[PDB]
Design a protein around this nucleic acid. Structure first.
Lengths: 161, 73, 119, 121, 154
RNA sequence: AGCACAGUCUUAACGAUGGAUGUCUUGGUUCCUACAGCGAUGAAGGCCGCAGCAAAAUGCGAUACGCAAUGAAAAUUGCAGUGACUGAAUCAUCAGAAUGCUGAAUGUAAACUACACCAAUUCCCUGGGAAUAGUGGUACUCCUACAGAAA
RNA sequence: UUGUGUUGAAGCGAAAUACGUGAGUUUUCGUGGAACAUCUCCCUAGUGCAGAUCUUGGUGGAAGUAGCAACUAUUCAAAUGAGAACUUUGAAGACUGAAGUGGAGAAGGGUUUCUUGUCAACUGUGAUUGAACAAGAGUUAGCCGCUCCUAAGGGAUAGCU
RNA sequence: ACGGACCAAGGAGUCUAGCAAAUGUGCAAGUGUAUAUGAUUCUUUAAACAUUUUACGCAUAAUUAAUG
RNA sequence: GAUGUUAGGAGGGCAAAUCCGCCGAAUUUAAGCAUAUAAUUAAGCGGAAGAAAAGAAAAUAACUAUGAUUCCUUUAGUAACGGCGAGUGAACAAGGACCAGCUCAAACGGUUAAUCCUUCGUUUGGUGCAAACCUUUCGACGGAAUUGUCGUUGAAUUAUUCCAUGAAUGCCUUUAAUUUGAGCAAAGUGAGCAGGAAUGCUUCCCCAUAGAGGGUGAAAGGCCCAUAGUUCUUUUUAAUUUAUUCAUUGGAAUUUUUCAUGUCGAGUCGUGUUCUUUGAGAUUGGAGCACUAAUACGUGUGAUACAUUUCACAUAAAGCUAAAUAUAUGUAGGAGACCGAUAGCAAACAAGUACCGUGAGGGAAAGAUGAAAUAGUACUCAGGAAUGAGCAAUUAAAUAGUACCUGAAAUCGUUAAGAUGGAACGGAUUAAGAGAGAAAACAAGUAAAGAGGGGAAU
């Protein structure tokens, strides 16, 4: 070494040319993922591909004040919303068995989120004009007229955010 | 950018600006931080005083999130 | 020169003896070629192709009747049965792959993924 | 131009042109139709056949007419009955003429040509 | 980039101390012209270039968003002044004003003939002529790299 | 019709030798995209053959530079020859048929076209009528089932 | 951006009352036969050679030089042929001297074998010759061998690692 | 003293990472929109454009082995 | 257990770029070198897929807490390791892509293996020309299995509410997307110049949702293929059409009221020691050996070895699982500020070819006539022939003649001029010769006649 430079620290003492990789296809992959998600949301025919996730609090004192999307509503939250986990996972609601509600604030906030999602739901009959009032907390099946008039209206994707 | 390089202006100068006597050899002083405390000691002591040795006690796993604390006056 | 469709209707006798006489005349042509004579050498190609056509029709007829004989019986010879890729042959059938137990079957019939909309 | 599945590469498509099989060559060797029978068959171009009356409008023989006598797809050439020339040794051979340099003036129609003009209709 | 091991796919041997030949590596064996010839090295025929080009060259650049927006705004402003357009090379001596704007019904015209007619009627007949007559095959070996023509910008 | 000394060196013009330069490029290289196992139903690889005249490469397998079928569809030609007035000449496709000896190679062997054992075998007609020394099978390990022997 | 090209581009050879201090630039004539610049400004790099016992290719003086030296030795006449010291025939003088340039085989070679042509190259001189080139042809087994047996030994099975 | 018989063509401080200095540029106690998303952009376009009112880096505060 | 050419089956080998196990260096750096580094790399052995592997916590955290795995941005060249030298070096949180959960074991079911397989048959219908394929449940037989298949996820009891059932009658439309293969597809072969030949130059017309490329005797939007666009055809896949009666056969979710706090993976975990591995440090994982557990109040983690103990988290020693991810391989497409025949792959070509080595292996050189050889040199003369020459001949051209585009230098020949006493060349200055040369190196203007070109003026 010479002059007044930082002492060198470069970790290039192994065969690194075999490990170099450069992403020429970053935006190409962007396009491919966009196309795939567009194709599946066309395939499922109206129902959004997004699933409802709970609002949870980030751990550690660094991110104490911040909330984000957790994975899965708890059993207590699903019960407060009035539905079983097995039924909830069939209508785009994520459920996890690991989280627990240590605070009434989190419990009620996620329950009210679930209730808002349930009220926003409109259910398509399983058997083509054989509407039934549903089980496991699934809302009653919408009928032909409301389904027709709601199918041509923009979906509320802000609830998932 | 390659036409602005300094080597271009030494195109016909034999030694390429690296000296006719000392020449440009391959690591004539060692590799990396080789000579600290032995023959690069003057450089190390003149520009990086407290480099050698260790001070203080170990913190085995840190978890910086515990002590993260931005300040405002 | 002979075409395949005309002799597709022949019996196996009239096919085999036609092949035999075609082979005999091809042998005569080859003998003439071996001798100094070369005038008729250009007919060898046509005779060979006619032999190939007759053999093709005869073999296709034999294969068809063998398949008719082994119709069903669920134990055809290996050459008669499917000649898929070996990995494809050893793969589990779609029915076996989609087979599900009673418990999960009744679970999925009772709680199927269902279509819905959002306001 | 807009179809990205089709290459515009010079080397790629001149390789295609110079190694095209005879089936593609028969279409590559098409020629313009004259005004009158262009009106008659309401089409613009047609691959040349062995017995078509043609008028060459390009090259040293740019005024001659004649019934074509042979089509050589290997050399991408056609030959018309009276456009012969003498060789050094002294016998006559037909002058190779590219189909793009001629215009059809009379076609020989057959059972298989009638169907392609019908498909064009 | 060149092939990764180009020029270095031979047997390395430089037996050249006392052979009265240069100490460059030589390919081994016999019975062929290649035997005993100078092996890999930028100065040897078929020996691999000095610093082989690599795909991890800095192909792209990250440009500050503020600088990009500044450049776009400045380009619009420059297009707004008559002298600058003339200097760039557009034949605009006959148009009325250089920040020229046209009715929204230009967005609806669909025929190239009427687009050209509108361009001419605006007073850009010279510009169209320059564009159409600039078309010509470029010099150099770029035209065997799918870069045959070179057009002027209108 | 005669005149230049010879050699050596220099210059110019025209040539010889050589294959640089320029211009071409059915090639390479790199990136992106997509699909992705082949094999005892005998793979990859290797030999040996196959064309009228035929060495290589390419293609093919005793139906052997190609059969059948499907689409196009009149040429293919060095000679000879072959083609309709479109299963025919030639392309393309390629699903049917066929695919020599080997090779994991697997009856025993192997610088052998060497040597076994068990079924004789194959074809034609709708029980007969022929022709064939030809054709199949026989490795080792393991699984399921079966068989009669054993303590 | 704005230009030159079949009324001849690039390149190349010789040059110029040419310009520059200079690297160079620009022109003329000849050749060439299809591309070529951009100095308006900028971007980019595998960007500038006298050397590296440099790499590849080509070519010199040495030089019509060294040399074409083992194996005792050739001669006369004729034939063929465009052409004969070294192809053939006859005559002569000689050699090898059964421990042989004599006959049979093995290893190795693989068509060199035979006949008919034939001479571009090769046959370090010539060559009409030839183991060269070209077209055809030629290898016949119950008894000669392999094949069988076992040897020094090799591979494999059972196990065991 | 070593290399160079001759000629042609090829022939050697480059690329990446990381740091700093210098200078140009933008913004400024902030600066850089990372990965990713959207969008009647999809030859070019693998680039351009954009980012529902505490992501992260560096800077904005230092010092101490350290509880701080 | 054996043995079976008993019936039906499987494994073996090739191929590897990405992927999974094992085994395992040294060059190198430390300016020496031994720990360290190179490197948990190369070489070696084995094993899979279109991805693989990992994966549904004996996990983090310490917070207001998160919630399978993988990958990207970052954490972070940080905590840490290290002759604390050279060097090495993670994890959690945070932001994103993607998003998916499950089943064995154990429990419970004996007024009844409620299971599974083989073989032989029966029909319920459908697309195929055919070949063949998808559905079909009534069995019978022979076995396997209580040394344990299957059902339930504690078991009953109410209430609602859902899901699977059969028969008969009718209904199979319409659109948008996506994806194969096919067609159709504008406008000059107008003058004139020159040329062997326009696609060139002038000039007169046009088409363009087509001015991408290629071919065509020279540079073509209008000559040809194709291109823009568009129409049919193939795959599936959304929304949209229609369902109506009659019946009993089970199953599921939640909610009422009780019984009972069940099960939860053993030479395994763990500990000691040894070796290796790791950033893991009184040991991170792995392995060998020795010892060898507890039973959910248990036992594992909480990054410093202990004892007593709180707290939090998780529930090891069994198993499956798509996506986001990777792809110096093969195949097929598309591109480039890449190379342009000593370059680019070794190979633009008959290239892993010729050729070399006993073998493992090593491994080249070599592209270009011309628009057209359907113009590849006819004829004559001289020669044995090769060749040469021509008054002869193709071509625009043969000094384009097959080694054929161009055709440099080295080296050599011919002709001319010059120099020439043991180097040659050279610098500087002139002189003599010999080639070239008029753009400053004289004559603007004026008058006449001859050939032309323009501009203004009605």
């Amino acid at each position: 070494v010479a002059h007044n430079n930082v002492l060198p620290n470069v970790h290039l003492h192994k065969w690194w040319q075999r490990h170099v990789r450069v992403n020429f296809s970053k935006n190409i992959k962007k396009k491919k993922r966009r196309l795939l998600r567009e194709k599946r949301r066309k395939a499922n025919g109206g129902t959004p591909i997004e699933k409802l996730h709970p609002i949870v609090h980030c751990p550690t004192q660094r991110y104490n004040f911040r909330t984000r999307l957790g994975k899965g509503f708890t059993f207590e939250e699903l019960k407060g919303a009035g539905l079983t986990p097995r039924a909830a996972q069939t209508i785009g609601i994520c459920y996890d068995k690991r989280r627990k509600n240590r605070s009434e604030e989190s419990l009620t906030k996620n329950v009210e989120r679930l209730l808002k999602y349930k009220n926003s739901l409109v259910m398509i009959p399983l058997k083509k004009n054989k509407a039934k009032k549903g089980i496991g907390g699934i809302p009653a099946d919408a009928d032909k007229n409301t389904i027709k008039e709601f199918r041509n209206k923009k979906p509320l994707l802000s609830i998932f955010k | 950018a390659t036409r602005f390089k300094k080597n271009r202006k030494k195109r016909g100068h034999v030694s390429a600006g690296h000296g006719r006597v000392g020449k440009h050899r391959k690591h004539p002083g060692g590799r990396g931080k080789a000579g600290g405390l032995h023959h690069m000691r003057i450089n190390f002591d003149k520009y990086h005083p407290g480099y050698f040795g260790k001070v203080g006690m170990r913190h085995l796993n840190l978890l910086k999130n515990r002590t993260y604390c931005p300040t405002i006056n | 020169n002979v075409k395949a469709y005309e002799l597709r209707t022949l019996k196996k006798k009239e096919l085999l003896d036609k092949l035999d006489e075609l082979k005999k005349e091809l042998s005569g042509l080859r003998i003439s070629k071996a001798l100094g004579n070369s005038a008729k050498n250009s007919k060898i190609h046509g005779v060979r192709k006619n032999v190939a056509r007759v053999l093709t029709v005869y073999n296709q007829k034999r294969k068809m009747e063998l398949r008719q004989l082994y119709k069903n019986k669920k134990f055809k010879p290996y050459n008669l049965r499917k000649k898929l890729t070996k990995n494809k042959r050893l793969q589990l059938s779609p029915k076996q792959k989609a087979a599900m137990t009673l418990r999960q079957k009744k679970k999925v019939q009772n709680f199927p993924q269902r279509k819905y909309l959002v306001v | 131009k807009f179809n990205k599945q089709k290459s515009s590469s010079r080397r790629k498509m001149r390789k295609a042109h110079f190694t095209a099989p005879a089936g593609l060559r028969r279409k590559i060797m098409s020629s313009k139709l004259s005004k009158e029978l262009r009106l008659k068959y309401k089409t613009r171009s047609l691959p040349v056949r062995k017995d078509d009356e043609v008028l060459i409008c390009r090259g040293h023989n740019h005024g001659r007419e004649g019934k074509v006598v042979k089509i050589n797809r290997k050399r991408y050439k056609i030959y018309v009955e009276r456009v012969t020339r003498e060789k050094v040794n002294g016998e006559s051979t037909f002058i190779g003429i590219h189909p793009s340099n001629v215009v059809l003036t009379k076609l020989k129609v057959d059972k298989n040509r009638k169907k392609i003009l019908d498909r064009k209709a | 980039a060149v092939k990764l091991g180009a020029g270095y796919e031979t047997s390395a041997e430089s037996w050249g101390t006392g052979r009265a030949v240069a100490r460059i590596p030589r390919v081994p064996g016999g019975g062929t012209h290649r035997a005993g010839q100078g092996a890999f090295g930028n100065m040897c025929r078929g020996g691999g270039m000095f610093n082989p080009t690599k795909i991890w060259r800095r192909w792209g650049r990250k440009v500050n968003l503020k600088e990009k927006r500044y450049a776009v705004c400045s380009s619009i402003a420059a297009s707004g002044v008559t002298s600058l357009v003339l200097a760039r090379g557009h034949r605009i001596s006959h148009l009325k004003e250089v920040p020229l704007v046209v009715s929204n019904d230009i967005e609806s015209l669909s025929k190239t003939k009427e687009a050209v007619n509108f361009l001419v009627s605006l007073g850009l007949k010279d510009e169209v002529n320059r564009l159409v007559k600039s078309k010509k095959i470029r010099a150099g070996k770029g035209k065997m790299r799918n870069r045959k023509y070179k057009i002027r910008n209108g």
